[PDB]
Amino acid sequence: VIKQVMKTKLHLEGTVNGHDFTIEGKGEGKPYEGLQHMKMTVTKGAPLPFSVHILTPSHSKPFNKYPADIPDYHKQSFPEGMSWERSMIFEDGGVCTASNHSSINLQENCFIYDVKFHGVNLPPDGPVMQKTIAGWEPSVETLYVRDGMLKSDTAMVFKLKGGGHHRVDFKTTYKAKKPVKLPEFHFVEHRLELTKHDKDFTTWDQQEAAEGHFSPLPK
Amino acid sequence: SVIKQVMKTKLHLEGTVNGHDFTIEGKGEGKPYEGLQHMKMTVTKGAPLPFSVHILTPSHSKPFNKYPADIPDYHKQSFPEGMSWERSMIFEDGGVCTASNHSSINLQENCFIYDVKFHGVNLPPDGPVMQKTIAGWEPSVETLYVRDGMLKSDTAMVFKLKGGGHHRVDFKTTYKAKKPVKLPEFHFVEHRLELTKHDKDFTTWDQQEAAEGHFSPLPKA
């Protein structure tokens, strides 16, 4: 059911700093190569009063490159689908929660994402509300099974405009709708980039490269 | 350079975990440019330890990181003046450990001297640390970046439970060179710490660690 090239369609409803908004995404990628892109459009609540970088990682699990000896938890869950849930704890008290439902439209060869996003206690002079985030650095995600689900940890660090970094702890749970071959403990390299946009970020292009692997260090 | 292809290590650690005082003494060796090292630990006071010794193994040597030419080695550059590190370890079950070190060098002995403090609090009595159900650490990837001229890091250090399953410990570490050094850009460090040999009650044991720094292998557009 997962072809060498596949489309994506996203619908996200969010509330950040008491500001409601709807985002619509349309993209495509090479699932087995771990490459994908998507064009976002803030259909409601534009212009957003916060850094859109807090939302970019909440916009696609079937596009992770994996070796043959690591079962792909996400690809195996389709066509039944999966869901993912996540908490994002910032260094300054800010907390965002995101959750998704991923399904497939076999006719269109397109993945359907329905996402919820909630941002609270973002400090008014912090980098999210002040829009001083330049983008995310690449990241290494650590994944292991917990209760038959795939749990992961990621110190997702963003670059500040003017230099310096700010860490956001991501705790995610991936939940396949039907049982799949569970993988052993492993890592996923991630590089998320916001490449093009209009002046006030009502529309933008975001891409992601992702590769799973065991530790390269010998025992 | 003051850092040779082969270097010795000497460690002294004083700790208090679950209100239990103890001292560890370490003696080891490694290849600083290859990112390989090993240390023989001995609990000189407070043996046998009433908790899993795995909580202490990452507190026992920053001059032993392999780095490419385009990533300045923050730790090696800090010698002979030395460096120090500080760390918090937050467990999934409320347990908190804090560790801090002072690293110096004995140029005549070609030996790094480590003085360590360790404190463990609120470890649940039926948790994996007090129940000694930790089999060891999994390999890890640490993320490093500069903050106030110091080198900060974040590592989800996950340990394997005996009988399967995992338990995450959030490590927040700060490395502090005593004199200014060429600071590196944001990067990662692969770690694989292994406890390879020991006596029945872990009064002595052999610990080793492979560590390699690198930027992300993924291409940037």
Author numbering:
A (entry chain C): 3 to 61, 65 to 224
B (entry chain A): 2 to 61, 65 to 225
Original authors' sentences:
The chromophores are trans and noncoplanar in gfasPurple, amilCP and spisPink, while that in eforRed is cis and noncoplanar, and also emits fluorescence. The reddish appearance of eforRed can be attributed to its intense, red-shifted fluorescence emission that peaks at 602 nm. Studies of photo-switchable fluorescent proteins indicate that coplanarity is more essential for fluorescence than a cis chromophore conformation, as fluorescence is also observed in mutants containing trans but coplanar chromophore variants. The other requirement in fluorescent chromoprotein variants is thought to be a histidine (His197) π-stacking with the tyrosyl moiety, which is observed in eforRed but not dsRed. Most notably, an unusual hydroxyl-to-methionine hydrogen bond was observed in eforRed between the tyrosyl moiety and Met161, while the equivalent Met159 in gfasPurple and amilCP only forms van der Waals interactions.
